[PDB]
Structure formats: C-alpha cells, structure tokens
Amino acid sequence: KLPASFDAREQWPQCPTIKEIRDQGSCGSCWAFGAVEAISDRICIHTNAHVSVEVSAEDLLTCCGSMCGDGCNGGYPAEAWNFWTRKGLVSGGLYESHVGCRPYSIPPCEHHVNGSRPPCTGDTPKCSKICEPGYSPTYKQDKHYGYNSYSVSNSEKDIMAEIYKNGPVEGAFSVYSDFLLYKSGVYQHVTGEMMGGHAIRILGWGVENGTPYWLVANSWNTDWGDNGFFKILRGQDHCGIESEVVAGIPRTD
Numbered sequence: 001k002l003p004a005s006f007d008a009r010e011q012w013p014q015c016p017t018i019k020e021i022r023d024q025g026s027c028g029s030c031w032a033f034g035a036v037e038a039i040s041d042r043i044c045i046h047t048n049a050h051v052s053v054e055v056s057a058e059d060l061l062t063c064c065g066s067m068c069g070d071g072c073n074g075g076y077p078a079e080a081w082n083f084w085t086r087k088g089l090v091s092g093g094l095y096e097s098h099v100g101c102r103p104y105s106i107p108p109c110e111h112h113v114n115g116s117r118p119p120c121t122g123d124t125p126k127c128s129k130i131c132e133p134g135y136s137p138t139y140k141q142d143k144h145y146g147y148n149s150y151s152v153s154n155s156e157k158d159i160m161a162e163i164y165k166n167g168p169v170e171g172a173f174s175v176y177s178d179f180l181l182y183k184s185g186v187y188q189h190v191t192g193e194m195m196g197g198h199a200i201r202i203l204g205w206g207v208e209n210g211t212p213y214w215l216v217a218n219s220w221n222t223d224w225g226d227n228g229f230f231k232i233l234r235g236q237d238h239c240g241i242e243s244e245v246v247a248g249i250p251r252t253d
C-alpha cells in the first residue's frame with residue numbers, strides 16, 4: 001500500500017538534514033556524500049528527531065581507505081555503508097561550518113554552473129582521528145555505527161517500500177552530459193555523451209506532468225539544478241537509477 005507520491009522532507013519534518021544540500025567541492029566524493037546524507041536522515045528517523053546530526057563526509061572520505069575506493073578519485077557506495085557498520089562515522093557539517101567533529105575540508109565550488117564560488121577543478125585529505133577545536137565529545141565517542149548494510153533489489157516497488165519504511169537511500173546512476181544542464185522537471189537522458197558514474201541520495205517519488213520520477217538530492221550545492229535537487233525518470237531503471245541502491249539501519253547511539 002504505497003502512496004502515488006512520497007517526500008521524506010514532508011514525512012519527517014523535524015529532520016532538517018533531509019532538506020539539506022551538500023557540496024563535494026573539487027573532489028569526486030559523491031559516493032561518500034550519498035552515504036552520509038542518507039545515514040544522517042536515518043539516524044533522525046530512527047530516533048523520531050531526538051537525534052539530528054550531520055554525519056561527516058570528511059570522516060568517510062578520508063578514513064575508510066582502499067575498501068571504499070580511492071577517495072576524491074571516486075569510490076563505492078556499498079563499502080561506504082559497510083565502513084559505517086564496522087568503524088562508524090563521527091559528526092561533521094559543511095565546509096567552514098564549525099559543526100560537528102570533522103566538518104568537510106574541501107571548499108565549495110561551482111559544478112557546471114556560473115556562480116560566485118571558484119569553479120570546480122580536478123587529492124584526498126589524510127585521515128584525522130581527532131575532532132576540530134571546540135567540539136566535544138572526543139573523536140572516539142562521537143562515532144555513529146550502523147546495525148547493517150544491504151543492497152535493495154532492482155525493483156521500483158522494493159525501493160519505494162525501503163524509502164517509505166526506513167528512510168532515504170543511496171543510489172547510483174550513469175551521468176550523461178544533458179544531466180549537467182538540468183534545472184527542473186523530470187530528467188531523462190535525451191542527448192549528450194556518457195560522463196561517468198554518480199552516487200546520490202534518493203528521498204522520495206512522485207509523478208509530474210504524467211512522468212513518474214524519483215526525488216533525488218545532488219551534492220553539487222544549492223545553485224545546481226532545482227535548489228540542489230533533481231527528479232529522474234522512475235520505473236525503467238533509467239541510467240541505472242534502480243540498479244545500485246544501498247541502505248542500512250542505524251544502531252541506537
């Protein structure tokens with residue numbers, strides 16, 4: 001019994017991380033952002049908004065190591081969630097936010113848009129197992145662990161049920177160049193060359209002007225796309241959007 005539309009921001013209005021858009025900066029850390037963003041949302045969902053924390057992309061990006069991939073050169077969503085269950089992740093906010101244990105260290109930049117920040121350019125930061133000044137508790141006690149991590153089947157209904165019951169998920173899809181230009185509506189690949197793989201947070205679904213879609217958060221800042229979000233065609237494994245969905249359930253802090 002699933003609704004025709006669902007938006008995690010409306011279901012869990014006291015979980016501000018669900019509404020928050022991040023910026024990977026000049027670093028291919030999308031695999032880590034999709035993970036920590038979904039984990040942040042699920043911790044809040046799991047505690048009915050009694051715990052709301054930004055889980056540190058910095059901690060995952062820099063401390064997972066080779067099991068997750070190659071840092072700013074790209075990585076793997078499934079192993080990000082596994083690292084969360086084995087070693088946990090500390091808190092950390094946006095660049096220069098002074099939020100949490102290890103806030104993001106890569107400065108924001110413009111991702112295929114004209115803006116006020118430097119344009120994004122072509123190096124993974126070192127793993128620092130120590131929190132930033134003024135933050136407590138210590139890095140060891142700030143860790144949040146997952147109970148498990150799992151793949152969701154390549155099935156529209158299965159993915160919808162997973163989001164409906166357990167919160168936002170991480171997914172992956174093929175980026176073609178016409179995606180770069182997205183502003184509004186439901187994206188479908190119509191033109192442009194293949195560019196590579198991208199990992200994102202899926203937080204809902206709906207139908208817009210007859211087209212079924214997934215509601216997705218990009219990590220290219222809020223001046224990209226639809227205030228940082230996009231919608232992509234749902235139900236056809238379009239660009240592989242339904243083929244690499246991963247999630248997991250938090251441990252209680």
Ligand SMILES: *[C@H](CS(=O)(=O)c1ccccc1)[C@H](CCc1ccccc1)NC(=O)[C@H](Cc1ccccc1)NC(=O)N1CCN(C)CC1
Nearest residue numbers: 028030031069070073074075076172175195196197198199
């Ligand atoms: C995030 C995607 S992005 O930066 O938004 C982007 C970049 C280019 C084209 C489209 C989108 C990163 C970028 C990785 C990258 C860095 C530098 C040059 C080229 C690419 N992408 C990833 O982390 C992806 C995630 C992924 C995993 C599995 C399936 C689909 C997507 N992984 C990735 O690109 N990797 C895997 C690890 N390997 C060592 C490097 C390539």
